[PDB]
Design an enzyme around this catalytic site. Sequence first.
Site, PDB file in Angstrom:
ATOM      1  N   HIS B  48       0.824  -1.208   0.000  1.00  5.15           N
ATOM      2  CA  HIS B  48       0.000   0.000   0.000  1.00  5.15           C
ATOM      3  C   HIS B  48       0.871   1.277   0.000  1.00  5.15           C
ATOM      4  O   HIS B  48       0.370   2.341  -0.311  1.00  5.15           O
ATOM      5  CB  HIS B  48      -1.005   0.024   1.155  1.00  5.15           C
ATOM      6  CG  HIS B  48      -0.399   0.376   2.478  1.00  5.15           C
ATOM      7  ND1 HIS B  48      -0.066  -0.580   3.421  1.00  5.15           N
ATOM      8  CD2 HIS B  48      -0.083   1.573   3.026  1.00  5.15           C
ATOM      9  CE1 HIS B  48       0.437   0.013   4.487  1.00  5.15           C
ATOM     10  NE2 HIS B  48       0.459   1.314   4.270  1.00  5.15           N
ATOM     11  N   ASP B  78       0.115  -7.539   1.660  1.00  8.30           N
ATOM     12  CA  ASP B  78       0.583  -6.135   1.767  1.00  8.30           C
ATOM     13  C   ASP B  78       2.101  -5.869   1.734  1.00  8.30           C
ATOM     14  O   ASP B  78       2.628  -5.046   2.475  1.00  8.30           O
ATOM     15  CB  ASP B  78      -0.041  -5.410   2.958  1.00  8.30           C
ATOM     16  CG  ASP B  78      -0.071  -3.912   2.728  1.00  8.30           C
ATOM     17  OD1 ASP B  78       0.416  -3.530   1.652  1.00  8.30           O
ATOM     18  OD2 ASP B  78      -0.558  -3.112   3.568  1.00  8.30           O
ATOM     19  N   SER B 151       4.393   2.187   8.504  1.00  6.55           N
ATOM     20  CA  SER B 151       4.318   1.273   7.362  1.00  6.55           C
ATOM     21  C   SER B 151       5.657   1.119   6.624  1.00  6.55           C
ATOM     22  O   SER B 151       6.187   2.085   6.077  1.00  6.55           O
ATOM     23  CB  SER B 151       3.393   1.880   6.337  1.00  6.55           C
ATOM     24  OG  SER B 151       2.067   2.052   6.779  1.00  6.55           O
ATOM     25  N   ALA B 168       0.599  -0.001   9.096  1.00  9.67           N
ATOM     26  CA  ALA B 168      -0.300   0.929   9.842  1.00  9.67           C
ATOM     27  C   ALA B 168      -1.772   0.950   9.458  1.00  9.67           C
ATOM     28  O   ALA B 168      -2.158   1.803   8.674  1.00  9.67           O
ATOM     29  CB  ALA B 168       0.242   2.408   9.738  1.00  9.67           C
ATOM     30  N   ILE B 169      -2.625   0.126  10.079  1.00  4.01           N
ATOM     31  CA  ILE B 169      -4.103   0.154   9.737  1.00  4.01           C
ATOM     32  C   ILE B 169      -4.870   1.207  10.595  1.00  4.01           C
ATOM     33  O   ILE B 169      -4.468   1.496  11.723  1.00  4.01           O
ATOM     34  CB  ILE B 169      -4.740  -1.265   9.782  1.00  4.01           C
ATOM     35  CG1 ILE B 169      -5.293  -1.617  11.167  1.00  4.01           C
ATOM     36  CG2 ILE B 169      -3.701  -2.331   9.305  1.00  4.01           C
ATOM     37  CD1 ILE B 169      -5.482  -3.118  11.400  1.00  4.01           C
ATOM     38  N   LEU B 170      -5.941   1.794  10.059  1.00  4.56           N
ATOM     39  CA  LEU B 170      -6.612   2.967  10.703  1.00  4.56           C
ATOM     40  C   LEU B 170      -7.682   2.570  11.753  1.00  4.56           C
ATOM     41  O   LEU B 170      -7.361   2.302  12.921  1.00  4.56           O
ATOM     42  CB  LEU B 170      -7.221   3.914   9.632  1.00  4.56           C
ATOM     43  CG  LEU B 170      -6.294   4.958   8.940  1.00  4.56           C
ATOM     44  CD1 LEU B 170      -5.201   4.334   8.020  1.00  4.56           C
ATOM     45  CD2 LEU B 170      -7.132   5.994   8.136  1.00  4.56           C
ATOM     46  N   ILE B 203      -7.772 -26.957   1.449  1.00  5.07           N
ATOM     47  CA  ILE B 203      -7.678 -27.315   2.876  1.00  5.07           C
ATOM     48  C   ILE B 203      -8.113 -26.134   3.762  1.00  5.07           C
ATOM     49  O   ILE B 203      -7.392 -25.133   3.809  1.00  5.07           O
ATOM     50  CB  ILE B 203      -6.225 -27.507   3.262  1.00  5.07           C
ATOM     51  CG1 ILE B 203      -5.593 -28.547   2.385  1.00  5.07           C
ATOM     52  CG2 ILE B 203      -6.125 -27.941   4.662  1.00  5.07           C
ATOM     53  CD1 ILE B 203      -4.085 -28.706   2.652  1.00  5.07           C
TER      54      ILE B 203
END
Lengths: 392, 392, 150
Positions: B48, B78, B151, B168-170, B203
């Site tokens: 990202h 990512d 990130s 870094a997720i918000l 699986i």
Amino acid sequence: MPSMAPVLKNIMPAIVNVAVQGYLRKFESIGSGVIIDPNNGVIITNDHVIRNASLITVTLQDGRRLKARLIGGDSETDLAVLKIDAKNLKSLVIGDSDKLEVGDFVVAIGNPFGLNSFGNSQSATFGIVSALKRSVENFIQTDAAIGGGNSGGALVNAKGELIGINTAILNVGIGFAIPINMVKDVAQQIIKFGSIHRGLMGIFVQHLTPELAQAMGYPEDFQGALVSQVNPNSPAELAGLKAGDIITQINDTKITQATQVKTTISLLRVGSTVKIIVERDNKPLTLSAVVTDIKSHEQKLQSNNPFLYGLALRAFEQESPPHGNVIGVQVVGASENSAGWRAGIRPGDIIISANKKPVTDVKSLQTIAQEKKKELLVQVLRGPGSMYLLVI
Amino acid sequence: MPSMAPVLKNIMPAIVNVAVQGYLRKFESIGSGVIIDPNNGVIITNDHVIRNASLITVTLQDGRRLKARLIGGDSETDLAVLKIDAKNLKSLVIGDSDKLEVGDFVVAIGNPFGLNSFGNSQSATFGIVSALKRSVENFIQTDAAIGGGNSGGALVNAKGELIGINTAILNVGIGFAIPINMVKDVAQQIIKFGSIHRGLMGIFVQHLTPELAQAMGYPEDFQGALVSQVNPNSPAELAGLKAGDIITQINDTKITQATQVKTTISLLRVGSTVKIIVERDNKPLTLSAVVTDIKSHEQKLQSNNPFLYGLALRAFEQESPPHGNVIGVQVVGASENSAGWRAGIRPGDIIISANKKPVTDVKSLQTIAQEKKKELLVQVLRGPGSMYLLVI
Amino acid sequence: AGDIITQINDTKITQATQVKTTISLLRVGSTVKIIVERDNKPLTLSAVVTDIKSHEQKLQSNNPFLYGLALRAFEQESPPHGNVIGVQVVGASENSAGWRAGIRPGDIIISANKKPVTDVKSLQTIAQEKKKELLVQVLRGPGSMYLLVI
């Protein structure tokens, strides 16, 4: 069993609460302070904690609520020095903040804006130095912060020594500190004189990266401060400093970092001779230079170039209906604080004559401006019209 | 005097700044990157960070601003791999992220979204691992975060080894990291082929809790990955895998955690034979299985069941004014991507005949669908009306 | 310039717009026959469509420091710097080596590899000092800074 408890218990009395009442409308405001001289009651906080104060009261860990005096503050470095008259006071060992590294453990002691107004107790928070000062760029940076951070409080290292003074700009989990070496010097000087009277040196400096060191013919690990510009008629110019010099020592301080230079010089007072050791194409030179008063320097500049001072000028030739072929010097810029502005000259003006004589280029304008007269008569084209102006 | 300063000073050059220009409208974006191969200039950041880039420039601690190439990225994990052509580069020891425990001290190195765009300096922040990856569930989790996190940067352990790559997720004060073992494998594979080409195994796996281990007849501390489902006509089925098997080794990796299985298999390429060691009612079995191409597998399924593929069907009998007694197979669901949808069949349809013959149950429908013909004629009741449709 | 194109390969050219369409869809590596009238003489030229990236790559390393930069001679009194003589950067492509190093439109290059810069040729000549870096001193408003273009 390891713990910061022993060192903190000893230094905690050194940290205090700072409460302020004033008018901006009446306001309250509270921050922290650190006692740096227990024998004379000398406390450091931030300037912004105590600005606009009519009343300042220090609360000690021991319980006393004491009336404090402002000895002086310095809004640029955001510091302020306070006196309380009281005995049985404690401080802590002051440390050297030039010696800090990213990764050292620190504790920030000082209540956040919300907290324990009432307890004589100062919150402590733990972390590491995250980045060194680099003028957010202006301070030591940490991950020791709580509640958006503390102002006026102490930053200490693992041994308990004071390495900076905290400050809170409006960066979640990030703490800031004004390094103690700088604080020391603004404290002494506010104590002796009541405020910092900054003078002029005229040295712009830049970080010497390994890249730049090598491209300039020095080893990758070479340290110093790169001079990026030396103004004309500045003290640095009188002293022999040139763009490309690498400053390595000022007075008694070895320079390894550009940020160092700018602090030292700043806090140095008009009158001071300053030793500057420099490297230039791999030869060392020792220059000497005198700090001067900024208003005096501007005076020199003005009375030296009395009519054209503060103006940016270039040669101009252009067919320019309705004027025909226009030859002159275009005013590209003009300080509001110039004899030229006061007479009416504006950016975009073409000066086509001076004292009734034609002006072709800048030089040609400067010569007529040297004429020993009381005034400069200037004819300007401004867009489609024209004015004569008198510069006094 | 303990400090993270010595280890960080050595590994800091390995961390870099990643600046991107592009169009989505033109945009800027900056994150961090880690040099994992100094000899070939191979940098890791997040996908990202570099998506939509027309330009990518890496700034090193030493000062160089370098044009970088995208070798390839993988949006699902990512991750993105970059090349810069330059010498005198530094990296760090790569570590084993399978070896991490809740409670280990870590440092996250990488600027937050706000900070030090301009200094060649990467912020460091200190803490512990708070929770291990468990697919927020998808990453190593820490309390080492600043400014909402970094990130592309490095997560390192107390020794200085790279144990993950930050993202870094918000989640205030919580830091996330993509574990380095996974990163290694997507890097090699992006380096060799330019991107991950995922295939199919079939699986589905679940965390084997102590509770479940014991209820299935193994000790409380037994480790492995519980197979919860094996699809029909899947590679796992060809290989002999059954629901209830406990996977303990895949190829050379011992499985102690269900999350392990899903990563390994993912990054494995169509064509690969894979060794799967399994425990089944306390007997070990070694199965072997071949990864296949997802589009090929869907082909097999379709050309095997060409008219009814993608449909969910059940037997249906019901008095249903105005139709009287309705007997047939109700279409309970239908993929938009089926010969049935294309012909007009919708959920809620009752199939009451096929090739003019009555349909009583699913089986009865499947048999007529096996008829070696070009097309299936289907009569459907839909609410109060009816259509004949042709499935090709 | 001022040639009139009458034909490209086997398409005959009667309007300007055809040129874009005939050529845009031609593949890298192709020989294109361009037939022209120049002063009422017909000529037939032959050209090879190159790859865009490779061409810009060629312009780039053929002019490794100043590529993408629009430049002009500059003399102007500029308080507080005094008389600034140098080369003003008028434009700077966002993909140039100069932009990457930190140069921006408006900057005035006053020195290169530690020598004064007066006109544009003076900068071009110093730029050819046989290096993998050009050292530039730029004046930007009231400040200054050394950059290394690589």
